[model samples]
Target: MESLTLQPIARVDGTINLPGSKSVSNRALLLAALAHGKTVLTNLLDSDDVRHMLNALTALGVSYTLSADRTRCEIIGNGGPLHAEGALELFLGNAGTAMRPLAAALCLGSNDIVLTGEPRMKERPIGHLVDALRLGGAKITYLEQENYPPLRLQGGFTGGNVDVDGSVSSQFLTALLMTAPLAPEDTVIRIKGDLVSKPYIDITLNLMKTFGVEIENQHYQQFVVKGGQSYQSPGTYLVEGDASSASYFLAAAAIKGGTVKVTGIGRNSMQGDIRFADVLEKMGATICWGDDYISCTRGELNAIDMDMNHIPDAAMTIATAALFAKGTTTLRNIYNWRVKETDRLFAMATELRKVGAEVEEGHDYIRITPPEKLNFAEIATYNDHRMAMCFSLVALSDTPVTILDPKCTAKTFPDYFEQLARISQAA
Candidate 1:
């Protein structure tokens, strides 16, 4: 693995405006493609994931024009009439967000298409989504395996009730829900037990409503959509700052000790991970809220037992925070952690041990107890974006650290280290 050295952080303090939310930007891009008229997007993220989505849209022959300065683009969306320009192929790289949702939506197109991604993504499960799409009458075939990718979609889906396994990644269920309104009939979704990412579902339903797509959530277990509810993209939509993205910044303060201000996100966000701020508050971080900004300062972060089912993405940040806590921090109910971009449980525990923090990992839990002193060491990032970003906070303890395969952060944040270091000083 390619490794890079990061100097020990002396102090971490500053105001940070994070990149636009990938979830929001991706959803908006899909809706923009469904609009009858041209729409303009502002402050869209330029990350690899979003870039691939844009490229796919262009390959579909959707008309768009950007200003001469390349600041903004006006898009004439084909909406539901996405005619595949013969043998369309999508190069999703490693972006699950772009790959999963768009894979389901492609079932709406009239032409045969193939969806492919990075080698690792080929291993990521899409069975839940594939099942739901097939149930909805989608013509999909596994070019590789029944549950794996290298998939092809030939016939489109007609709306119907689809039973989905919500215990896995919620993105699968969400992908079907997003494409449902465009179906031939209204759709009914039956969710199986223990939905891991309910908040992502909430975001999907809420955005569908904004686009004039009517849907009813039946007690969190099912969603009913009326047939023939078409999409007329509302011209433009703005993406909020990603709470998932801001966790690394707060983790810096929690581990190291300093103040940092983050803007363009807060408690009102639809993203469930916004609870990251609340988690920091519970850890004894001083937080001050403004109309559109949230500022954080160092506090006595005592270790606490946490049931983190609601905030798995934020838990990675909390893991770094645990390294600096006075005692043990125990996190439970993270079974979903195993199937993420990597086995985050194993990765975090292994890396924490390298830094001299005592960590015990289980199938569904991780316990971290701070040592009197930590031995500085290099961290191995398993080519996962969260791995690179989560370890960035470990620098707060002023223990010498290096990140192997640091460029993996480009899956989302390309200039993550450079940008984060500008607001941080190494002791």
Candidate 2:
């Protein structure tokens, strides 16, 4: 469908088993390839992002067996740095998870590899990661504009000490940390600025520990990893459902109460986006949680002012959820939003206004004030998956919402609309 016009949904209730976390799936795949034994990954996300990582792995000569449905994968670990005979090129399609981490991991080997991506990917910054890698004696060159992707890695990383700017993206730090153990010398990494998306670093650290590499984090300012260490297969690793994806359902319930339950993410989830539920709770939604699930129900929603930098991707949901709030909702300290799949700050403001909300788009933050009566409009997704998924919350109101390019959700949650339909109930 070129456009999807969602009829007003009075109630949203039911269970949603979300797809795997794209962040976890990509990170796990890279680590599994570097480990020494076979690794079985269950509940892997079968989407464009994960497919890019898988295809890149295949191009790099890492062998893996993907199940018929693409959710379960058995990877034969390379046992060390990848050993490809010639130069390789990987066109990673706008998957930041694949681009940043793969750029770092490739340096662990002695091959010439070029990391390129979609047109939009070229605009996303990778300078921080490349600069940190260069500090550790890795040779990387920009094939196009400086400080961006289309990077060429000339292998040789004798890691010792490096500093990476963390204000832009935590992926830079994650990329460095993941490859630290494989370096020829002990790697000491210091943050040059206050790290945004700090929770994502926690996810990176947690997953590294699962793969048998424990990084010593010094109060979120520095990390130390002993060289000559190796990742050992955990035998089987299960990926949790995308907590970010669950935000749509959770917000759906909060916007129209019928008590929506989402499985695959809960107290034990390693994803930072799971904290989005706490944000909903702060906004007066009733929430219940267990080890593997969370349920949300409507309450008297009110506006909230929060520093949503830690959960930037999930924060996009809050922008739409604000439509149901009593006052202006403010999300602060998210300058990085400008560099995501789209200028989310601008995109959110533009779309929110289209839906009759009073929106203030700031240099780094966004404020939304709900309107007394929403205007029916077609929301443009700008090819950003979060924009498409977040705006679906508008339909919970009496106003029908039409979404342009709803298919953009395929970047992360391919069946987002279908899943939304599953839990929708007529008013």
Which candidate gets the maximum TM-score versus the true structure?
2
Q: Write the per-residue lDDT of candidate 1 for residues 232-329, one digit (tens) a residue.
A: 76777666777788888876776555888877787577888777777888888887777666777888788879899888887888887788887899
Spell out the clash pairs found in candidate 2: none
TM-score of 1: 0.95
- TM-scores of the candidates in the order shown: 0.95, 0.98
lDDT comparing candidate 1 with the true structure: 0.80
What C-alpha lDDT does candidate 2 achieve relative to the native structure?
0.91
- As a whole number from 0 to 100, the lDDT of residue 389 in candidate 2 is 93
Query: CA shift at 146, candidate 2, in angstroms?
Result: 0.3
lDDT of 2 by residue, 1-427 (tens): 4999999997989999989999999999999999999999999999899999999989888899988989999999989887553557899999999999988988875768899999999999999999999899898999999999898888787798899999999999999999999988999999997989988999999889999999789998889889999999999999999999999999888889889999998998888888999999999999999898999988878899999998999999999999998899999999999999988999999999999998889999998988998989999988899998998999888889999998889999999999999999875
Which portions of model 2 miss their true places by more than 4 Å?
none
